[PDB]
Symmetry: D3
Subunit: 309 residues, 6 copies
């Protein structure tokens, strides 16, 4: 049912002790920023591998800085709390860890910088799909993606998902599995919760970060693996909508989405299938990396030894 | 300390019974919409007057519809729950009532329409400033207001305040009391939490609703009282930034802000002071209306008889 | 099968004589502008009534002027050619008349002003739905409406329908009957082939012409009939997307669309149904006008006497 | 006078057999997409060389896919039909071949995907200017170029030329030979019918494809020849208006425009003349390629042997 | 040759005494704001009439406030200095008076608020064209008008004319007499130095002030005279480009431009000529007002008695 | 006090001879363009080094061409006049030289191309800060930077500083030392008078020129020295606002600003200080270059031998 423990404001406590009032933190949620961090269980080694833990903890500290939450936690403390909780929960399987930071005020509309900074971290069992061949049908939304002018997508804020839900609602009631966004200038931005890649003529193409997207750690991982293991050309550039309809392959990528193939966009089918050949190679490489079976990428992994069963 | 009771999912319960897990509803908060409703205590009558209760309950139902929360509550139930809670709390003074509606999912990123609709209402003591002459110094923010393209301001969503906090943070660290917004086209929109009025040459001027603002009930109340009691011309139109610097008077208005005078905007002083003469007349008229001493506007008030002490 | 005749370049000819080469006029079609004009057959009088013939002929002359087609035809000639063809075709039933003007060049990319101006007019049986209660489900498109910057919607050009087809394709493959457009600023513009009206709180609301819409003769007719026969308030203004979702009623209007009720927009249902009460009154008034049974609006009708069977 | 034959819907027929009704296909023209393909006659070899035939046929298939025309023709069929028609016409000189694809509906406003796909191909004598030194005076138009938001320039649609004609009309009545466009953001896009290059400080500069331009085969050819034969730096980037006024050289390029020098832009003269030195080298290289006298680029040519007179 | 006197920094001095260094005030000119005020000589009365002197002096004080020039001069002082200089110059004919205010700094880039405020006023003979029937041919520029985002057009700043000169240069080298501007959204704004009016179907139409135009005193005068003397409908609204091409009449208006008829716009001719009938009535009414022969508008005039020769 | 001489319209004259009327050139200032050129005095050599004199003179000639000032001066004449004036002034210390070109008309609003071109050059003692460690606190302005649509930033026009002063006024009254600008699309552009650099993860980042910035000679110098002397990666790209808040270092650069460290942006502190390590290396390299003690960059220097005291 529930995990054994969670971390809250510098301490690990039993789950059933973290009880709050219904009315606590609704205003704090407007400030809230989060990470999603993966743990992958290698039963042959008896070790959990936490993927790019310090990169996620540094992004959370940056998101907190841009919200203007007062300084209270460190990068090393968030990394250590993640290790400690995965160990103490004693769950030997794939997990998601979610730090969530929030600033709490004396008044509903006090400025963030006058608030108190708080954080919890919780870890729960996750289901990987990296050993499954599946694909989604996407649409481009009639809703526009937030930009730096109004709500910087660089900040991994809960509030940014209100714009996401406009698109994901539309996609589901219009017969699609997932939405892609255009930015205010009309250029391809990202999915509702992950970055998008395209494959055309043996090249990987992905929107550049100033297209108004979150600076994904999975996106970075995929560009590295595509260049260094497969020797592919990867272009980070402005991407137009109609060119994506002619993509040989396409996929979403994100800590939660892992590598998720796109079969079609607005009912234009990816010519080489889903997962396409290059997608399938990147999915297999990614999997072997995160489960600790690719020594070349060991510096991306934080092992937590727990015992081999 | 705490109110005696609150309302939750169709029931009134003692405050200390509304306990939840720390991890409950963070994802639901992305969906959340709310109202702020005023109760004004008339000790001479022993009655609380709840201001434009049905208008607030209908706006909440509209906000919920635009979020796409499944149907669960009615306008009449939200009006009745507000009356019941103000009575049962037995607090004989000015109050704020806040309904907050949220949709809760099986998964973090399930579409809103597959969720369950929930709501609470809580009522707490409020401090009116309608018998005080005070004023704020405003700036125009370097952050842009959300528009219909990305996050419709018509929806009174918690998430819309993330954009608000960009502006209110900037205002406070730059020596101002409050921020005003420009819309993406560069035209004057609203404050961070209330609508803005200007007075120039004996006329009231306010941004039209398609300038990208919340359709305020206080804004509506002020236009009615300005036209019907004072016989003023009121223009709802596109408003430019530099014209506001030459305003004779200016004020913010909102359920929480009541009528809040603006002394200056980007260090251009309102020529007729703050509160200016027309501002002061509207503030006095508003006060007499909401405290039940203006029979002409009785249809805006819901009395809750509680006993005269 | 085919009509008896058509009009071409100042002459009426038998249908089967208007034969051209497959390769003729493809480049001319880029220039082409058109009207759709209704004839309504009153069997009790033995008369066809052609609706607002001179207004349609003047709009065609304006469209031709803005294309910069050399002067060749007159308003009176287009009105007379329409009368003559409806008479000579000897078809005693409702019809559509379509003038189509085009400029033909010596070279593919010669400037319009160096071309020759040509025109045909043809008339075919039409099916009215004014005695039927039906409704469409609409979406807002993810494709943006053309504006004055790139392709003025005031010009009733064939080429403007390429932008229309982006929206109408999307609507049909996404489970809808019809698309509505947003303009580049994000404000409600028009349908793919007709103007849109909304009814809310007993008022009619329609986008103002500078929202980037064709200046519809049906739109003008509806505003006149709503004000003069029903005494309704009609606002021509900037209209936001989410406000339309809360419309009590909505309808499309156009020479071809007559008065077409909208039941829902992006799966938000019009609260008072489709056709709603005000829609149903305007549809009945419109019908009685165009079939010549409303003496008040006789100056909008051009009778063509043909014999009462 | 007329060519002997043309191709229509999978068949070659004598020209005078391709007769249609005046009223046929005006609505189909809104859907229509086309290619312009060059044949260059080498009298010393008795061979026509058709330039980048498969690239043009693949672009036509992509344009047809983005229109959503049902599948009916193949890339190989369009390549073969082009060869067959050039041979059967027995015209031993430079030619233009124009495929034109169109979708035909039961009703005026049926969705493209419910239509029937049709196509013709015709070939006519062309005049090359590759052995002539000439130049055009250009202006930047006051009309804006279509973008992906409203009418994707990637689609080689007849309708896109309505926006072209706004600019080319203005240029001719204002004393210029040709118009250049700015995109909605104000950046340099393309000519009315061809891409634009600039030369400054020995470098070639051209707008990147996401500046909102057609992905020209001549543009691709010029970048290849500039890099591979001349060893020039070529930048594909965002280009500003005023920087173009300081260009040492400039030229238009396109299947129809071949390589067309620009002497001046808004009455700012290209400092190194027109054709400038680098322009003149690219024009001479291009010519030798397309007439089959550059063995290095033979894979771009489809020979059609016809006999050496 | 030169006027006898000018006013400078609170004093009238002989012209030849106002000598400065070549290097003085170039940086101050970036700050500079001005008015153009008309004096009209009535030889029958021996009086100069200065038109709407206080309105011009109040606009100058507002422009100075928005620049943030320190307070140094008053509205009454600028009105009195104008009277005094017109009298002391002893020139009995039509004149232009130009106040020019500037802030002077210790350093090139010191902030305006740390500078010293200075002003001169000079008066010179002017030529009225109010007794002449003439007309200009206009174009719409390919250059965009400044908006509130970058350079508020409400401020009558010298620097705003750099944007004007982009348009007026283009107009003259392209064969036109004058340029009109579109705003960044593509809507009609103003001329390079005056506001624009259109006449269509017996109504006057002019861009609303938030279209991004200077709040002209001549514009205000024309709307008053059109409504009050002619009983015309005047619409201040958003105006589209192509609708202006169909105007029956059009004219520029401004203190310097008086009432200047427009014969054509982008080679679309105003149907009722130039000056058209309504234009000609407004020109005659304006003239009789400013020369002091319309008692109804006497409160707009400041007489300066000088002697009747 | 004053320099001995200045250059004016092809001649050197004693300072006190360059006297003009107060009313001369205010309209000419709208046209005016300028350069700021540095002279650095090396007392050990008895030589002034004028930095990138020909690059500055060529930019001035380009600015003059884009204004459309008639041809009157040459690049070589402006270079020679600068040398001559620095020599004749006999001032042995660091100097600023400012050429200022202006077009003078017969009438206030004559087109620039009908005017006369004039120019002066003056040289004055300057204070270098290259031997000082200092830093500025910056904000991003609520005012938008001019773009190519309205006032091309490529032109180094006095009028462009009116937009600058909106930002620099706001910065000073809001407690900051200096303002940075966002462009109309919301991307980082430049400072009020200089370009901006960022350092993050050992890389230099600066907005690309089409972000709407002046093509700075100091910017070019810094990119050259960073790549060639330090071996740093330098990215010229679109830059987002929030990424700049996370910069390790930042600095302004310009002929007047030399290399000016930024300690903070909107109260986000540059993590590695100000001047940071890479900033400090570039400042020291720049200094040694301009004072003639780096033989590698001698071709950037124009020596003027004056005698070693
Ligand atoms: C979190 C997130 C991503 C993916 O980031 P990773 O670091 O790869 O998990 C992409 N888009 C959005 C909107 C996100 O919130
Ligand atoms: C709630 C709110 C207002 C004021 O609305 P009332 O109905 O007058 O309380 C104004 N602006 C915003 C952004 C709001 O959230
Ligand atoms: C023709 C048309 C209409 C309707 O115009 P009527 O004069 O009412 O037929 C509306 N929208 C568009 C795009 C049209 O082409
Ligand atoms: C066809 C076309 C071009 C040139 O394309 P090529 O493949 O080089 O012929 C350029 N611009 C536009 C708008 C076009 O239609
Ligand atoms: C001064 C000016 C006008 C006209 O203003 P009046 O008060 O009528 O002289 C119009 N447009 C611009 C840009 C101006 O500078
Ligand atoms: C002059 C200037 C700069 C710096 O240019 P340098 O050639 O380095 O002096 C930067 N920004 C603006 C706006 C400028 O006017
Ligand atoms: Cl809270
Ligand atoms: Cl540990
Ligand atoms: Cl990499
Ligand atoms: Cl939840
Ligand atoms: Cl009750
Ligand atoms: Cl009212
Ligand atoms: Cl044709
Ligand atoms: Cl007749
Ligand atoms: Cl009406
Ligand atoms: Cl057809
Ligand atoms: Cl063959
Ligand atoms: Cl290449
Ligand atoms: Cl100065
Ligand atoms: Cl006096
Ligand atoms: Cl009036
Ligand atoms: Cl001058
Ligand atoms: Cl010398
Ligand atoms: Cl370099
Ligand atoms: Na701890
Ligand atoms: Na498809
Ligand atoms: Na490791
Ligand atoms: Na209940
Ligand atoms: Na002030
Ligand atoms: Na009541
Ligand atoms: Na005829
Ligand atoms: Na619904
Ligand atoms: Na009639
Ligand atoms: Na065949
Ligand atoms: Na020139
Ligand atoms: Na070949
Ligand atoms: Na005085
Ligand atoms: Na004309
Ligand atoms: Na008077
Ligand atoms: Na000289
Ligand atoms: Na800080
Ligand atoms: Na040198």
């Amino acid at each position: 049912e529930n995990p054994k423990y969670l971390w809250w404001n510098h301490r690990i406590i039993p789950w059933e002790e973290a009880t709050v009032h219904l009315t606590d933190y609704w205003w704090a949620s407007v400030t809230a920023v989060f990470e999603v961090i993966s743990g992958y269980w290698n039963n042959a080694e008896g070790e959990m591998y936490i993927f790019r833990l310090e990169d996620h903890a540094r992004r959370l500290e940056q998101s907190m800085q841009l919200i203007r939450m007062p300084k209270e936690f460190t990068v090393d403390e968030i990394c250590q709390a993640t290790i400690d909780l995965v160990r103490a929960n004693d769950y030997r399987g794939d997990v998601f860890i979610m730090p969530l930071a929030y600033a709490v005020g004396n008044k509903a509309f006090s400025v963030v910088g006058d608030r108190t900074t708080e954080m919890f971290i919780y870890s729960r069992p996750a289901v990987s799909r990296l050993e499954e061949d599946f694909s989604l049908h996407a649409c481009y939304s009639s809703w526009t993606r937030i930009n730096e002018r109004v709500l910087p997508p660089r900040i991994k804020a809960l509030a940014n998902y209100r714009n996401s839900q406009l698109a994901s609602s539309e996609a589901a009631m219009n017969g699609y599995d997932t939405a892609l966004f255009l930015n205010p200038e009309g250029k391809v931005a990202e999915g509702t919760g992950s970055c998008v890649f395209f494959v055309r003529k043996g090249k990987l193409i992905t929107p550049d970060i100033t297209s108004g997207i979150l600076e994904s750690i999975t996106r970075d991982t995929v560009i590295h693996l595509a260049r260094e293991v497969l020797g592919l050309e990867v272009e980070e550039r402005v991407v137009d909508r109609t060119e994506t309809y002619l993509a040989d392959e396409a996929f979403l990528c994100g800590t939660h989405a892992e590598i998720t193939p796109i079969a079609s966009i607005d009912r234009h089918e990816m010519k080489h299938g889903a997962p396409g050949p290059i997608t399938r190679q990147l999915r297999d490489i990614y999997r072997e990396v995160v489960y600790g079976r690719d020594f070349r990428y060991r510096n991306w992994l934080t092992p937590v030894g727990m015992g081999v069963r």
